[PDB]
Design a protein around this ligand. Structure first.
Ligand SMILES: O=C1c2ccccc2C(=O)c2c(O)c(O)cc(O)c21
Length: 111
């Protein structure tokens, strides 16, 4: 079999929101639910208010990279939805990739 990491977000966002668990810090909410697979999958939901397209797309690239490159510390078998918060929006231009990575991994490790 091949390697997959993308979540069926349109299909499953409501399910994960309702039936999943959640963790949060000042920058992110993470929703997660067991997926019956031997790997975890990621969806990213960025509210329009987070910023214009370029900023939203940058956040998405960052989060995808963090998920892709740190699977050794991210529990397996979960569908995971990452939602950036207003405070991250407010501080986004003052923080770097590595700061965002620390804050996201802190949550993903606790699933
Ligand atoms: O979706 C959620 C969410 C879902 C389940 C539990 C808590 C939250 C939550 O606390 C939250 C925020 O604080 C926020 O600022 C934007 C959000 O989108 C959420």
């Amino acid at each position: 079999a091949h390697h997959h990491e993308r979540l069926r977000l349109r299909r499953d966002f409501l399910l994960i929101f309702k039936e999943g668990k959640s963790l949060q810090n000042e920058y992110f909410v993470v929703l997660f639910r067991k997926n019956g697979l031997d790997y975890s999958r990621l969806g990213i939901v960025v509210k329009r208010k987070f910023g214009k397209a370029t900023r939203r797309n940058k956040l998405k690239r960052w989060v995808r990279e963090i998920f892709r490159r740190n699977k050794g510390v991210i529990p397996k078998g979960f569908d995971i939805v990452v939602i950036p918060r207003k405070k991250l929006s407010e501080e986004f231009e003052r923080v770097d990739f590595w700061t965002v990575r620390e804050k996201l991994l802190n949550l993903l490790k606790r699933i």
